[PDB]
Structures are given as C-alpha cells and as structure tokens.
Design a protein around this ligand. Structure first.
Ligand SMILES: *S(O)(O)Oc1cccc(C(=O)n2nc(Nc3ccc(S(N)(=O)=O)cc3)nc2N)c1
Length: 274
C-alpha cells in the first residue's frame, strides 16, 4: 500500500518539531528518479514515538487515505522505511513549512488578498475531499504547508498544500482532544464517534481564524477546563481584527453540525468578498 524505502537511502538531519506522539526531521533520500538519473531529494521524516507504538494503526492509515487520492493541494507521501523498531513516514519536504509559524513571521505584512487566496486554496482542497467523502479530521494552520510564497514580481499567489491528519481523534486521549479545542468540534469533544465530514467545516473555520489572526492561537490563554466550558456555554471565537471573514468563521463554526455550510457554498462566499 506504501512504497517501501531503504534505510540506507534515508539520512536523518535536523529536528523540525513534533506532532501528536511523533517527531519530525528534515531528511535526505537518495533515489533513482526519471530516466535512471540519481537524485538526492530532501524529504520530511515523521517518526512515531517508541513509547506510543499502539497508535501505528491510525498513524499510517491517515497517511494512506490521503495518498490514495492525488490532488494539487494534498501533500505527497513517498512511503515508509523498513527499519523494524521504527515507524517512519517519508513525505515531501515543503520549502516554507507550516502556515501558522509563517503567519507569525509576517504578521504586519500579509494583506487581506493573501489571506483570501490561501482560504480559497484550502477550501478547494476541502471541497475535493468532500466530493470523495474522505474525512480529514485535523484541519489546522500547523497542517497547512506553504509550497511557494507570493511572487511579488509576477503577482503570483502563494500556494499551499494540506498535510496528513495523523492519529485519529477517535483513538487519541481526551486531554489531547481538549487541547485541540477549538479545532476539534464540540460534538467530537462530547463523543469522538461524531467524527463526520461536518467536523472539517468547523476546523476550517478555526483555521480561517488563525489565517486572519497573525499566527495567534485561538483560546491559547484558556486551560483545558475553561476551553471545555467555552463549548458548554456555546461561545464563539472573537472576531479577527481583519474581520472580512468573521461571518464565514461563525457559519462554519456552527454548534449544529448539519447547519455547517458546504465547501461549495464556502467557496462561493469566499469568491463574493472582493
Ligand atoms: S505537525 O506534524 O507537528 O506539523 C508539522 C511539523 C513539522 C513539519 C511538518 C510537515 O509536514 N512538513 N514541513 C515541511 N517543511 C518545513 C520547512 C521548513 C520548516 S522551518 N520553518 O522549521 O524551517 C519546517 C518544515 N514539509 C513537510 N511535509 C508538519
């Protein structure tokens, strides 16, 4: 199901961070490309923790489901490595990394048309998954990767890709799900079996908030318990200073899952502004 990649062809380099029960490294893979030519291609290496090996089922399924579909806005997986005592995903290395760190580093420089253009690309990706009834389950700005920046010469827009969702929130512990508030929908915080395509409409709304809030994290100042009570009080995220998308955020973040707008209608609202 996954292309098998040789240990000897994978050189692990610098730590780039970590996700849920994973460590992330920038890497180097030696490979025969097209025409027989040998390449040294940089790769991203996602290693499942040596202590949480029980989650390997979901870990690789999440990369597997995305990999079965091919789309310009979904990150490419090259495969796994036959290491034995390790579980390593070999994924495409995106030049500029996660969108949330990028938005911090350019707070006072991303204008509204940049945020709009990134929102349309993400909504296009989500609509694609929706047509295929594939649930992502972890839509956030950390899982958005910037392939290219705005070519202020050609006025060329930024291009983004959506990374894999990682271990499902259906098997992950509550504490993890409660720290993922307000990306994890209230219904999944009440019962993780509520994971549905509507979950991705809620998380897209929270991502749109992050894209409009210069790398700021929603409910960061709130501890797990207070975040849990934010949902019990049916509260809504504060409107971003750049409030050109606050209505779409509130419409996508509807406490009633079946009232959440389709990605087709979201794209139409995104195209109506400007
Ligand atoms: S999550 O899994 O914690 O989010 C996450 C963390 C690290 C890497 C990735 C990821 O999927 N990915 N990142 C890159 N490229 C990249 C480029 C530059 C940096 S930086 N700012 O630290 O210099 C980081 C990462 N490519 C991929 N596939 C997800």
């Amino acid at each position: 199901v996954f292309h098998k990649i040789r240990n000897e062809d994978l050189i692990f380099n610098e730590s780039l961070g970590q996700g849920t029960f994973t460590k992330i490294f920038k890497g180097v893979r030696r490979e025969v490309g097209d025409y027989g030519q040998l390449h040294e291609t940089e790769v991203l290496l996602k290693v499942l923790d040596k202590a949480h090996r029980n989650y390997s089922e979901s870990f690789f399924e999440a990369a597997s489901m995305m990999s079965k579909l091919s789309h310009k806005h979904l990150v490419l997986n090259y495969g796994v490595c036959v290491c034995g005592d390790e579980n390593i995903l070999v994924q495409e290395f995106v030049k500029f990394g996660s969108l949330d760190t990028y938005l911090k580093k350019n707070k006072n420089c991303i204008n509204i048309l940049w945020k709009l253009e990134v929102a349309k690309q993400l909504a296009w990706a989500m609509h694609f998954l929706e047509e295929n009834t594939l649930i992502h389950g972890n839509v956030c700005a950390k899982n958005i990767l910037l392939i290219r920046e705005e070519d202020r010469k050609t006025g060329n827009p930024p291009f983004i890709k959506l990374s894999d969702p990682g271990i499902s929130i259906t098997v992950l512990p509550k504490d993890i799900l409660q720290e993922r508030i307000p990306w994890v929908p209230p219904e999944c915080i009440e019962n993780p079996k509520n994971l549905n395509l509507a979950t991705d409409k809620w998380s897209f709304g929270t991502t749109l908030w992050e894209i409009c809030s210069g790398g700021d994290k929603p409910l960061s100042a709130l501890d797990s318990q207070r975040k849990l009570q934010f949902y019990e009080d049916r509260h809504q995220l504060p409107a971003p200073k750049w409030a050109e998308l606050a209505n779409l955020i509130n419409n996508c973040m509807d406490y009633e899952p079946d009232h959440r707008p389709s990605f087709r209608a979201i794209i139409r609202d995104l195209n109506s502004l400007f």
